[model samples]
Target chain A: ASKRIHKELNDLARDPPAQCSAGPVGDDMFHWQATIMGPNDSPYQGGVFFLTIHFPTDYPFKPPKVAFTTRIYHPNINSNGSISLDILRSQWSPALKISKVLLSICSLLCDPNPDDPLVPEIARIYKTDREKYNRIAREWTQKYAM
Target chain B: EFEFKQKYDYFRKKLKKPADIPNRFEMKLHRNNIFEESYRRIMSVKRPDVLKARLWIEFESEKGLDYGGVAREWFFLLSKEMFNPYYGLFEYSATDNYTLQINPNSGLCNEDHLSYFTFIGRVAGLAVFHGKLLDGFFIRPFYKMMLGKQITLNDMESVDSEYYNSLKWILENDPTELDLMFCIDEENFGQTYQVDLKPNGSEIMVTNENKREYIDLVIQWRFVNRVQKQMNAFLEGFTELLPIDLIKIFDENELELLMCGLGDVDVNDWRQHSIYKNGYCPNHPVIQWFWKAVLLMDAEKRIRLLQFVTGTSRVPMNGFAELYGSNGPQLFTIEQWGSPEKLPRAHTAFNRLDLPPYETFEDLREKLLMAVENAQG
Candidate 1:
């Protein structure tokens, strides 16, 4: 776990994403804090979202658990800040890195998957009334994520 | 459920405890030694002499019909007792449900235990040879055999009794010229290769330069460039199948990285190590890790990951293992990744990804982060 995490951190530093950044929270490499800038042309644009990553002892073999520290209204991310990403779950492969995860989070902000959603109401709104969904997401980003 | 029940009943009738099977290390050695011996024995025979002895092999798979369970069976029939030195039949079944049954006509070896090892090689030959026919792209043949206009023979009697009887009749009637005109007579049979039986010196000779040519053509015309193209399609569609929460966390670059990491693996090299070298290589740490860790996952877990990557169910995850506890420590050790010398050679995607050599985990992390920062600037 340490070996993989170290490599990931190094890779993250070398090629920091244009819209996101992450580092060890303190002395513990397993505990990390990350930030994803809202994507352009999205409801959350201009807002910076914070996330907490807790790496299991197994590290790359098991995906790090990621949750939003800052609340955002999105179909995939829930009210409690927990996100439902496949790469972090059953779809997770040891090949994925922290930088990749952060970038995925950023992309998720840009285009939400309404079908298999963490927040069903948000998904429904996004599907049935996309404008309302965008308005609520924008309001949440301005009020909280800003 | 019926298939599972049948498997359970088969196990109950076969062994005392089905689940209490050989460890991964033991199984790896067993499979490797088998394939090595089979290859040696097969290649040992002179080119013309090989045709004198009849070698029959049959392989089949049921794709969608098996309740999403991919079912495959293969068997080999040889005129010589190369597989078994003993007089009687030798049979062994693995925990993963592959069965090997070898029948030796003449007793050549004094010991009974040797026959078990011989059976292992025969089974490995069947498996390895089938893989060669499949080449790198498995989905093509799998679909063709499943849905195309092909005839398949499912039972052993069709080969042993029905086909063998016809060959025996030809040999008896025409002693001077015995031509085995064997072809796929049943539905869903994918392919067939034939050899000529003729006189060589004092003994009979079997020659099949045509068989070699046929395999080459199969590889050239059928399997060439198919896997790479199909793999790209699967990787592109992977995000669509994932949960929305999971999809939201990935950017285009990260997704591309993941696709490359999963798709860029040399599966042929991976299987060769598994079949011939006990799945351990000092040079290929990534391959070793995959064989020991990822490949050993449970069927459901294994298939889920495979479908996510390939978007197809043609591939099989042969070995399954526990990640943590007793099996975990033995299969995967932290020391494997700790030393620079022990690190995987940069042949595979895992090692090819840019990273510093291993030292203390803390130092490695610091160096990696520093390097990343430098690269970004």
Candidate 2:
């Protein structure tokens, strides 16, 4: 099942959805790794970030535990690999596929869920100083993900 | 009798009268194994079990708005049952003039020592340490009988200190002891005891040695229960918050099976045949199956089933689908059902293709419809 997700992710990455880019890590289907270009005009712009997806034995029935392995200066991603993404919590559905999930994650990067940001400090910064937040995000991509 | 009275008066002179309010120091001293003599005297008149039951009953009786008051009363009642400095050896002597000490090898050291009472307190500490509400009736006697030959507080403390050191050493230097303590090696802790239903079934068929081994395993598993209980609470909390109705869920017994990965079990003869041989573990597979079956039943029947299992109108919420971690959900899956493919047994080729990706809800709907159409073909 994860192999199928990996393949769909690779396919999505190749096709290059106008919004984002994502695919599996190296050759490991179970250990998925991906990147999304930050939304235009937002502080996250020009930032290419990475994420790690670990599919448990019970996929679909159970949500894949996903984490941002790459340091993305985002309100939603905590210093630890913990993500404050809804698909991991309340809004998850078995019907959602890998490409859809990657798209949703990209949307999350563009629209920070300040209401439930794992890194509340970053969320505060994003809320208080938009320009500073954007600069930091772009810097993070160059220093880490890029 | 003369010597007894003399010794009592001497100790009495050295100690302060029981304070109007139970002092924190006094309580700690009692807890720390200072009031050995007094505890024995109280236990002699009223067995620890009976005292605990009475306390539990009293606490249960005082319900309604004074619930907090009742709880406080229960705490005091439980404390009294556990310690009586005047009649039991559970008092503390903190003044510089007096010092409490015990040497088990010394001839003056009677079976009733301060350390023995402290041992009882230690066992009680361990029990409460597991976060269970204090139930003296259950805990008191369990400590009493289990401590068997090691009847005194000193005996308990000695054993506990050794156990603690052993645990610390294992944690720091060697970890195998931790594994053994957790029943990781089934052969070390697991044992089967046969219960004969038929009169003709020979008593000799079920030996005493098997029973001993099984009981020991049960004790070790009780520790595991402490750990599992915490994990279950978290899982249950998350699952309970789901969008689904409580009616959609089954009681704990049914949950045991489904969550354990056991589909269903024949309930009629289960009680007669299915036994742990060690002790009762509600998390056992058969029990889980019974509950899961109830949950799996048609939606219409679920409300009735929920009402039947839970006497309250308030049912557990649904939302367990979220907590997927390497340690928790993984262990739960391995122990209960092995893997998802093994579930609903009818599905031989359970590995279906992944769902198609979509950008918008319209695209998602279109993909879903196409997928459905393909399934029909």
Candidate 3:
């Protein structure tokens, strides 16, 4: 299980995820942190976004606990810093890697409602008030991230 | 003109201070057996007074007599023998005729090696107390131990530059990346072992929080603790004649001065004062070239040549004329023997050296210097 996390790291080292990185935090290798730079014109592209990953025991079966630390006014994530990226559960059939997961998060940043927004509160607000979305999201990303 | 014999009589009197009873120590060496016999006889002499007594050194038979003649020979040959790597007592550290340090692997080689270090200790004491120049230099830490100074990371470099630098680097950049442990690994002959720095230290990892303690323990074990038994046993023999308080007054450097004189040997002084024989004389072409080679020598190199020639204790107030063997003032004597192809040889007992008459200064210098540098006991 320890070696599985490390092997994924070598693959990530050989070729990291696009527009994002996930690395072990200082002092220990189990807790990984990374900074995601969204595309310039996109909502999150206004500033940086931080992510957290904890490699757990029996880790090859259960994917690393992945989440965001940086606040963003994105419709997908809650104020609690967790993303309702439900696609994560099905794909983790014990095969999704740290680098693969981060890229999955990164693609989510670019394409906000790929499959469909999961939560209903911001779901229609994102759909009906789309212009209101970018304005609020961009301003919050600038305030909270940088 | 120097009264060299007078220095010997006064020293014996000065050395036996507080000890009123006058006694002589008779030391007889045989060609068949030397150190074992020396060790057996010297250790057997229970009278502490006899150690600082009038010491007489002579080969078993066919020897002339003793003044300071044979004693000088005895010391150099014996020192070269005792310090020889074969003895498993002391070894060199630096390149090109280096300083002596204890061979750490000696215990693995000899089960009872610690006791023999006592023999070396006694021999070192005899050289300094009786004023004989030992053939090699001692590393700084070795001298530090003689002065009873605490060994530090600072003293580690002279003995192990490679390990010292690596340890220093580990301090600057933490050992977490290196993934070290609270133990040292050792390699003996073909065997490898992991030695814990403390109790169950082998199980401990060298994390950032305890790295400072780890390094300190490493230095302590390497310099002080590992060598503890051997060194204390040495002091047992060393302190028998010389008091600890008396010897402790000086620092590491002056301890070196006591072991080997600080001053350089002068060429003309040796040339003019020397007793020459076998078609040898001052200002002769061969003698002129010989002096030239000696003049070109570095100060310590010259001292080695001087020590080689005379076992010429330290540079006294007057000249090498003050050099005594056993009986009396036996000045440095040079006798031309054999051919130019032959390497120069020392007859330390007679304050005499046998040199080959060579035409070239380079050839004469190389062979002459080479002969003395590599002489065995």
Candidate 4:
């Protein structure tokens, strides 16, 4: 099972999904490093974000802990790098693949479920002042991550 | 409440008799007596917290967890709190440190060993705080195995959180998010890092290199930095806290005690003509005073006494005494700082005119030791 997981994670890392780029971080297969490009028309456009995926000691039995290392001014990502994405919580299933989880996380960055916001302040700003929110996010990515 | 007659034969059988039952006023006085005696007894003896400190350093070095010294400081603080206030006889003085006095029964206490049943609680508390801060050495290997990749900070944080939470179910104090542990396979390996009771003592095994290394690092690190230093400092500090005159009496006793421990040497023989060679050199007046105190104490009391003086569990007074007697004494003034000879040698080693402070900790330690000796003297 460990060998299979290693092989699969390695293959997936080598060939990331269209919207995002990810691979096994350097030498280890269970840990993955990921990069996501901002959605084309969303407030997060032109922003690049980095994250790490850590599979549990008992993978499939438990969900991998995914966290953003790079700063993101989005509703889903908390100040401590915790994500409020549904795929991490109630939406998870044993059969779910790493690629699918990445896609779900990618979509979360674009749309953002404000009702279930990780950073409520960021969500409030996004909802109350959409133009200002987009400018702030763009500015943050340019200054820090980019 | 059942009443018992002081003279009754039945009371004698049950209460182990002839034992005087104190009245309310007497009980208050008795409590004060116990507290005073405990404090006085703890203060009277010399403990070897320094030896424990050196042992801890050696243990950590042996185990290959030579991370930075912050872990050592924290370990010293924690272990002092643990052995003295927690396990040893110094619970009264332990109350002085507000951080150390935290209620063990409360789930809020930082380290484990609150209630002995919570073994994992102790290991987790020790490992997580020391393990995480010291470059996350404990869980790194486990992270590598699980992630199928080299360990990173995020992986460390994630696995650390997972282990902490999982430990809650195995040993509950605080609840964490990653508490539940579902098996990889029912027939295969059991849950990792489970605290198992072994014949020797409680043990936690992490087979993966990173995880194993991390655990070993924490154990060795704690022994060196925390356990050893606390034991040493407590002994030394407690010794200083003693009434100044009492130290003179204790020193008189310590000289004879060192003779017995060192075996077959008459105090008179040493007093004759070897002031620099044996008397004043290796057995300096102060050092002789320490040995004399050790001789007066019985075995158990002697151990406690050692703990008291050193503010630790062990002392390398023998080594210090040897250095005192040797030619090293001529170079060893209380005000002297650094490895007088080695500091200059160190400057020459790098072949540079001015090497930075970061390169020579031994030299720095020598300087600090000298300052401490001068201050104490």
lDDT of 2 by residue, B1-377 (tens): 34534543443344222233222111111323323433443335322222221112122233345433443443434444443333333321111101111221222333434334444443233222222233212212122232222222222222222223323333334332111211221111333222223343332222332433432333333222222322223223222212122212333223222221222222322233222212223565434443344434454243333222211111111112211122222000111111122221111011111221223444434433333333311
Question: Which regions of candidate 3 are displaced past 4 Å?
Answer: A1-146, B1-23, B93-97, B104-111, B260-294, B297-377
Model 3 Cα lDDT, one tens digit per residue, B67-170: 45887877766766677655677765532223567877779867888778887787778777888777666668778887878877778765544456556665
lDDT of 2 by residue, A85-130 (tens): 6666445554456677777887887788764444545666787787
Per-residue lDDT tens digits for candidate 1, residues A1-146, read 44356766787879887788888987777789988889998999889999899775434333677889998999878676877776766456444567778888888889898755555557768988999988988999999987
- Chain B TM-scores across candidates: 0.18, 0.17, 0.64, 0.16
| lDDT value, residue B165 of candidate 2 | 32
Identify the candidate with maximal DockQ.
Answer: 4
**The best candidate in terms of lDDT:** 3
| Strongest candidate by TM-score | 3
Over 4 Å off, model 4: A10-15, B1-377
> Candidate 2 vs candidate 4: which has greater lDDT?
4
Docking class of 3: incorrect
Deviation from native of the Cα of residue B97 in model 4, angstroms: 26
How do all models score by TM-score?
0.31, 0.31, 0.49, 0.33
Model 1 docking category: incorrect
